[PDB]
């Protein structure tokens, strides 16, 4: 729909940007208010840093993917400077939150709860025929009630035919990305499943970098030998074995996110 018919379009005047949360090459992220009272996150595009079409493509995708477990699109301003306005998540990224004094005190029970919430979000994405491709604790946000939501849909894509193939030139974080995606650029929900396994290590280590003490070339070489990540300190063996399922060699052997959700809820209630 054009901007004058789009239910997400809001006049810029409805927004007051209050506190800057991040700034990068491509713009800024602000905590702000909509119509005086409603707290929102505002992501602004830095003119010229990247295509406005490419910028807004993330919002169009979020229009299609609405769920309690996914960070919700609130509004857009489609005239420069372009804003994507989303649900504000009071406890920030999961990776940061697990290091704070509150984060540090969380029991294994609560961490397992949070993991299940994430798999729940990812099971919705899976059901809808999407993939995320950037799944990692930095892209999970935490609410004031300590619930978790999937965030950052910049790389997320609808599939028609099982697979999205990236470019030859395209580069992805080695530690989080499935081997078939790094090697062939072929991404499926099963690649996201692999990333979820890595995300689990971040949860249980309170945000530590995966594959302790290893460079990227060492990670690639270890995996090719059939090794997987060494058991993190203080990881329940059950959870470790669940990570290993995520890291199966053949994508089709990796579990569904609905299975992962189910298992993690069992782990959580048993604890
Ligand atoms: C300082 O970072 C914080 C960020 C948030 N919330 C948010 N931070 N954040 C982003 N920045 C992530 C950074 C780079 C900051 N790690 C990006 C997007 C698209 N949305 C959000 C929210 C969002 N949707 O709310 C809440 C905090 O409260 C502790 C602290």
Resolution (A): 2.1
Among 67, 88, 109, the domain-final residue is 88
For residue 176, how many other CB atoms are within 10 A of its CB? 25
Return the closest-CA partner of residue 233 out of 247, 260, 218, 213: 213
Give the CB-side neighbour count of residue 117, counting CA atoms within 13 A.
24
| Known catalytic membership, residue 144 | no
At 144, list the tokens. Answer: 């004031």
Residue 40, beta-bridge partner list: 32, 87
Domain region containing 11: 1-88
10 is in an annotated binding site: no
- Residue 199 backbone dihedrals phi, psi, to 5 degrees: -50, -40
Report residue 29 as tokens: 């992220």
Q: Where are the alpha helices (DSSP H) in the chain?
A: 52-63, 94-97, 101-105, 108-127, 179-184, 189-204, 216-224, 237-246, 257-270
Residue 17 belongs to what H/E stretch?
strand 15-24
| Residue 227 to residue 259: CA distance in whole angstroms | 24
What residues contact 148, with CB distance under 8 A and at least 6 apart? Answer: 69, 94, 114, 117, 118, 121, 140, 141, 142
Catalytic residue among 134, 144, 233, 258: 134
Asked if residue 89 lies in contact with residue 149, where contact means CB atoms within 8 angstroms, the answer is: yes
End position of a domain, from candidates 88, 106, 122 = 88
| Dihedral in degrees, nearest 10, Cα atoms 127, 131, 135, 138 | -100
Experimentally, the structure was elucidated by: X-ray
Same domain, 229 and 150: yes
Report the SS3 class of residue 30: strand
Give the H/E segment covering residue 77. strand 73-77
Cα separation of 188 and 201, whole Å? 21
Give dist(CA 162, CA 144) in Å, integer: 36
CB of 86 closer than 6 A to ligand 1? yes
225 and 185 both lie in a single domain:
yes
Q: Are 131 and 35 in contact (CB under 8 A)?
A: no
Residue 264 has a CB neighbour count (10 Å cut-off) of: 22
Closest by CA to 196, choosing from 270, 251, 266, is 251
Provide the domain count of the chain. 2
Residue 192 exposure: Cα atoms within 13 Å on the Cβ side: 30
Say whether both 106 and 232 belong to one domain.
yes
């Amino acid at each position: 729909k054009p901007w004058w018919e789009d239910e997400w379009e809001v006049p810029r005047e409805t927004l007051k940007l209050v506190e800057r949360l991040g700034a990068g090459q491509f713009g800024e992220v602000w905590m702000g208010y909509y119509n005086g009272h409603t707290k929102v996150a505002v992501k602004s595009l830095k003119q010229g840093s990247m295509s406005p079409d490419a910028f807004l493509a993330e919002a169009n995708l979020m229009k299609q993917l609405q769920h309690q477990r996914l960070v919700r699109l609130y509004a857009v301003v489609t005239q420069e400077p372009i804003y994507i306005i989303t649900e504000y998540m009071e406890n920030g990224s999961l990776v940061d939150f697990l290091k704070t004094p509150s984060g540090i005190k969380l029991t294994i029970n609560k961490l397992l709860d949070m993991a299940a919430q994430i798999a729940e979000g990812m099971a919705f994405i899976e059901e809808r025929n999407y993939i995320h491709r950037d799944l990692r604790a930095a892209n999970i946000l935490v609410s004031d009630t300590l619930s978790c939501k999937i965030a950052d849909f910049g790389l997320a894509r609808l599939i028609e035919d099982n697979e999205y193939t990236a470019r030859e030139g395209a580069k992805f974080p080695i530690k989080w990305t499935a081997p078939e995606a790094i090697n062939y650029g072929t991404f499926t929900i099963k690649s996201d499943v692999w990333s979820f396994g890595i995300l689990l290590t971040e949860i249980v280590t309170h945000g530590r970098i995966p594959y302790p003490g290893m460079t990227n070339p060492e990670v690639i070489q270890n995996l090719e030998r059939g090794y997987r990540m060494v058991r993190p300190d203080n990881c329940p063996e059950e959870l470790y074995q669940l990570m290993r399922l995520c890291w199966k060699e053949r994508p089709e052997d990796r579990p569904t996110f609905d299975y992962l959700r189910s298992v993690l809820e069992d782990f959580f209630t048993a604890t």
